[PDB]
Structures are given as structure tokens and as C-alpha cells.
Amino acid sequence: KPRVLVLTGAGISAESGIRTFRAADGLWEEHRVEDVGTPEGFDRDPELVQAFYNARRRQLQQPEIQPNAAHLALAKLQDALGDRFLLVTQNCDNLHERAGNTNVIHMHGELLKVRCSQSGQALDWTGDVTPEDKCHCCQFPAPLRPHVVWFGEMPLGMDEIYMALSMADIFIAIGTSGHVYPAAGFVHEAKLHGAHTVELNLEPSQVGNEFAEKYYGPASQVVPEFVEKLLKG
């Protein structure tokens, strides 16, 4: 069985009703990314930033937000390939987990976690973060921040991701925009180490000869059809 590495971005959770980074009007939920997605933004206006992620964390857990056919297909793919499968996601949502995927690498962190601003230790967290909310790891309780990787910060799990990029027989990018690095560079790394590269997306994430195989359309349509084709193949 082939080693398969899957990278997912915002596009896969779009049909589930989760909205992010349109590199068009430059807006995240009618916020400038500088203001809600950088360390400097958090430094300038922590109450705004905490409010923003409070809103995202709440919206994530609303009844109308469900994994879609694409998420389910990836859970089935992991079922079929077992340890020969790795899912890396740029997404901070828990929709892959709800669909049934396990050992998901959240390279940009998780909305349902916060982090101690002092120790850097993460903590499970489903509710709002208020100034009165402090860490569980220090004798003198420290402020908490979202466990989300901001532009300007280092992604998580990169050693493990680059190892898998080397090992992959097949690399699949799903719902990625191609504007966000280093994730957008993963296809180059995969192709350099001999992987067959596949893009499943609404719009091209990259210009030219990198993806050897490509299918475009709604994730809920393109992803299950590729996974089925892969599984019977």
C-alpha cells in the first residue's frame, strides 16, 4: 500500500459553513488579518483578538456546523490505509476529528485549545477566554492565548511533516489557497522526494507543473470521488 500524505486547507471546511482568509478583499470575517492574525495584533488589542477567537470557537460548536462528505471521505481513507496515512491540516477546526480521523497534525493549531502565555503549554478549552481566565500550569497563573498559529509564528509539527513529505508515495492537497507558507510549499518538497502529487481544489493553489494530477470542484464532490477512485484502484 502507498504512503499517502494529505494536506487540507480552508476550502474543505468551507461547505461546512466555516469562513476564513479571502486573499481578495483581504478580510477574515470583516477583520484585517494584521489585526486578528498576528502577534502584533494580539499585542495591540488583546481584547479584540480574544473576542474574535471567542466568536470562532463558539461558531465552531454550533449545531449547523457539520463535517461534510469530503471530511468523511478522508476518514474512510485513513481507515483503509492505516499507518500508511497521515493527515496534516492548516485548519484550526475539529471537523476532521469529528469525521473520524485520528492523529491529525494541526500545523496551525486548534481553536478548541488555548495556550499559557508563559510556559507555552496547551490546554483543552471549549468556552470563551476572559481576562479572569488563567493557566493551569503555573503557580502564579498566567494569561491565556488561543492555541492558534498566527502569521509570523512557527507552525507546529514541522519535523514530523517534513519526514512524511519525504516518505510519501502520494501527496494530496485539498482546499488550499496557495497563499499561505510554508504549507503552500509542501507540494515542491513532495515532488522533490518522488511523490505523485494531487490537487483537489476550487481554484489552482500553484502555477505550473507541480501537481501531476488535478481535479477541481466543490470538495464534497471532488474529494469523495478521488478517494473512491483511489480505494478501488
Binding site: H108, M154, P155, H179, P182, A184
Partner: peptide
């Protein structure tokens, strides 16, 4: 790989 960062063109 470097830090999370945005590219505007292409």
C-alpha cells in the same frame, strides 16, 4: 520551512 506567512501575488 520558516514562519507562517502570506504571499499576496500568485
Amino acid at each position: 520551512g520558516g514562519a507562517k506567512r502570506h504571499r499576496k501575488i500568485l
